[PDB]
Amino acid sequence: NGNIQVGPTGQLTIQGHPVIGEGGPITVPEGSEITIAADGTISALNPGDPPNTVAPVGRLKLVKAEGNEVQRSDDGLFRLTAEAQAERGAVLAADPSIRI
Amino acid sequence: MISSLWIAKTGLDAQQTNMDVIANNLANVSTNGFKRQRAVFEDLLYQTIRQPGAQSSEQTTLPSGLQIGTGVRPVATERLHSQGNLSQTNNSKDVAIKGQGFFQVMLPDGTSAYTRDGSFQVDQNGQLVTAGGFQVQPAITIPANALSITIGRDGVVSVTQQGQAAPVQVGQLNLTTFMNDTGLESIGENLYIETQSSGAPNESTPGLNGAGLLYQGYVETSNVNVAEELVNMIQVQRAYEINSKAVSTTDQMLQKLTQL
Amino acid sequence: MISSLWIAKTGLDAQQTNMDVIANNLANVSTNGFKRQRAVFEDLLYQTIRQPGLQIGTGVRPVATERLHSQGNLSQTNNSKDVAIKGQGFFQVMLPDGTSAYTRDGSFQVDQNGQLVTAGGFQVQPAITIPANALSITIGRDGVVSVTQQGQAAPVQVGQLNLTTFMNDTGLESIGENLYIETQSSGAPNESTPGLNGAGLLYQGYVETSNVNVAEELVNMIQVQRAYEINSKAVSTTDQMLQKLTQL
Amino acid sequence: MISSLWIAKTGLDAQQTNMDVIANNLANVSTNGFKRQRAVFEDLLYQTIRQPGAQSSEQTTLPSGLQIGTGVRPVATERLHSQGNLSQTNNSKDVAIKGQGFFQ
Amino acid sequence: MISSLWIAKTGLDAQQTNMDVIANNLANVSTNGFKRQRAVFEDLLYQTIRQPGAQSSEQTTLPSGLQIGTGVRPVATERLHSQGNLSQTNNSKDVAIKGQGFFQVMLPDGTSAYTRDGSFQVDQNGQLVTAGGFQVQPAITIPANALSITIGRDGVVSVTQQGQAAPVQVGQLNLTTFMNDTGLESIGENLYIETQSSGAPNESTPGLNGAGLLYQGYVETSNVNVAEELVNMIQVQRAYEINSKAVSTTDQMLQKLTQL
Amino acid sequence: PTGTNMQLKNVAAVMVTASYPPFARQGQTIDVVVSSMGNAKSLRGGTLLMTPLKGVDSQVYALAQGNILVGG
């Protein structure tokens, strides 16, 4: 689900779950316009300011996992199977080849 | 209900405004002291969608991203304050301006208006008024038994009475100049009033630091160039054609969606 | 569900975007110093099916519109205050909030206390102060604004009209009323005198007209209408196939 | 809307300027000490769709590329300062100049 | 969206480029030292499909396969550098070239352009400049109290002073000739800048090596032949109408394809 | 160069306040309070560069530089 929604405090949540970036959960400046990039780079623009101040604030963590390595949990979110957990670690390393 | 239809509607309205300006310019060809008007348009807003200059990828940025524009809207109509060609009407009371000045008149309300037209008459009381009966400042009083009225280049109004070899001065016609001449509010009746964008009225003698020279027996006709108006009429007609075609094309597209 | 409705929908939306661009180009055919826009379409992600080799598409999505920065035709205004640009360059105009935008519309006026402003009233950098008793305003090819006064037989130098040149003219942000602001894709606004360092020249009494060619827009409208009809037919075919499926 | 239309529009203004100059010259036939005007025109902008002399290939160069031009513009209206014919009015107060001087 | 429509699009736009060439030639009829332009068109791509020459039936080749072509593109516009008609204006400052030479002019930015318009003026310092204020090279300076200026057909310039019965040479007007005169880039203002396709500037005094001869009191009028322009109008209109007819036919075909 | 665009993200302009203690002698150290002055999100692990602490008489009485401790 790519339907990302901002909050009044500025954090990125998907279905109420905060989005995970390279610095952990993604927090974006409050009241800013966001442009996700082909590699997940998040650029924040403050309204009123000139377009010269567009500066990135983080990067979405995009991971690659086939259907064999993921099993659905009871809350609708997929997670690594035990084998795949022991093979590729508990925390998946982000793949830079993923386009978005 | 669909964006392209609003954009084409705005285009149609702008072209209709341009045609209205053209028709107004052509309707005032015979008006003395008339200045032709030209409208200037601007585009309206721009939908952001994808902010250009954003990070397209960690090391690269988006060059000239996706901006969707709205229609068009007229900014303002500017006058062309240029010396309209002069004409000899051989009348002692017609006055024309060679430079950049204006005559001052008093409205019945007590306020002061400014007119460039110099077709003047005399009322029953002997004061110099315009064609609409408004009393021209500074209130030159022409006496009962006048034989000839002489208005010089510097604005002196003199009356030559019977049997006197010297002429009697009865007033002094001054001209008002503005910092921004196009900013005046036209109320019709060949009258312009001062606004805050037209600076302040600077009174000056006709021949001094930039007021024009007054010519007696001359009238300043309108500066409307008619061949330009015909070519612009052709242009406006073709543009209205194209905008109406855009409207019709959008109409044809929505029909297929209704049919779906 | 999983089908072709979305493919066709993404297609229609692209034709709608192209038609919006065409309508914007046509509506601004009378604006002075307007650069036509062209929308670039470039397809979505592909889904790969593995054999014991084939890739299915997903649709089309608009990426970025480009403004064509060619030199438009000049027209006549016989107004001494209007200047057009021969070459590549932008007039710098100061917005009320304080940030400087960049415009190519050369139709200027003098405001109530001197000062050269655009048609919207915003002041034009570098600031000019025209004297009140000016008889004729002359703007030279190299941007020197000289003013003649009655009596003195020599014109008085007032200001220089500097042109701001960007290395990438397409990346400027169009803020609306014939104004562009610099962006990260069009950085480093280079101020120069007109005529040197690649800056354009100035023609006084002329204004630069729009860049919109008409035939391209009309034929593109024909193509957009017909492609929209095609995508609508595809949507209808998918609808009928799903209707036949559900009736089982 | 069409470039050809703008080019013709200018040309029309240029010819109208020529006509106005001719009319003004004819209107001042009997005036003394008059100098007839003459208008000079020049090329307007030149759209460089294809650059003349562009290096199309590493060996061949494109000669005289696509230089689409815009209309015309009058450079100026210069007065022809030449000695007009002298005429004898036979008045003591009438003076005429033979060379290139001016009265102040 | 369909091939025939793209081919017809090239067609309309190219007949317009013609139309622009015709309009540019017409607008500069009164321009002194103007050269008329002519556009050249070429064929666009040709889709191979069946390859012509490929062997069918082992011993029989296939002649003239499906070379389906795309539209048209204009190659380039070439100026017709021919001698325009000389017009006598009886001026000491108008110079006309009768051969194949160019005057050299210095732009204030440092580089040099080349012009054929011979209407020269004198600045406040006495230099011979172009009507646009650009200073001619070499650099003819004219004395203050000049009574008559004589420009010979050899390019020598003489000034007759008072009290001197012998004219004094104050300069020498040279002509610049090029290998290819069509390769000069026209920058407007009757000025050409040298490009790499026009060779290098060859200086020559008027009468030798080919440079033309300079006439005083004459101006080289434009070589635009106008009846040819009208006949070209009639074609540029009929061809555009026919291409639009092709567009309409393709539109009808696509409409019936859609409606079914 | 005077004409250039600097868009920093790791620098904040701050005001430093301190108390000049009784009978203070040169070379002694005092505590300072560092407060941001414009649109800065945080001062978590920043370092205060050389700052001259003026008095009411606009004379330098102390020089401030160190690592800021923010609660967290």
Swiss-Prot record, chain A:
Gene: flgF
Subcellular location: Bacterial flagellum basal body
Similarity comment: family membership: Belongs to the flagella basal body rod proteins family.
Source organism superkingdom: Bacteria
Subunit structure: The basal body constitutes a major portion of the flagellar organelle and consists of five rings (E,L,P,S, and M) mounted on a central rod. The rod consists of about 26 subunits of FlgG in the distal portion, and FlgB, FlgC and FlgF are thought to build up the proximal portion of the rod with about 6 subunits each.
Protein name, per record: Flagellar basal-body rod protein FlgF
Swiss-Prot record, chain D:
Transmembrane regions: none
UniProt subcellular location: Bacterial flagellum basal body
Coiled-coil features, chain-numbered ranges: none
Family per similarity comment: Belongs to the flagella basal body rod proteins family.
Subunit structure of this chain's protein: The basal body constitutes a major portion of the flagellar organelle and consists of four rings (L,P,S, and M) mounted on a central rod. The rod consists of about 26 subunits of FlgG in the distal portion, and FlgB, FlgC and FlgF are thought to build up the proximal portion of the rod with about 6 subunits each.
Protein name stated in the entry: Flagellar basal-body rod protein FlgG
Gene transcribed to yield this protein: flgG
Boundaries of the shown chain within the full protein: 1 to 104 of 260
UniProtKB/Swiss-Prot annotation, chain F:
Compartments it resides in: Periplasm; Bacterial flagellum basal body
Protein family membership: Belongs to the FlgI family.
Function: Assembles around the rod to form the L-ring and probably protects the motor/basal body from shearing forces during rotation.
Assembly and interaction partners: The basal body constitutes a major portion of the flagellar organelle and consists of four rings (L,P,S, and M) mounted on a central rod.
Protein name (record): Flagellar P-ring protein
Species the sequence originates in: Salmonella typhimurium (strain LT2 / SGSC1412 / ATCC 700720)
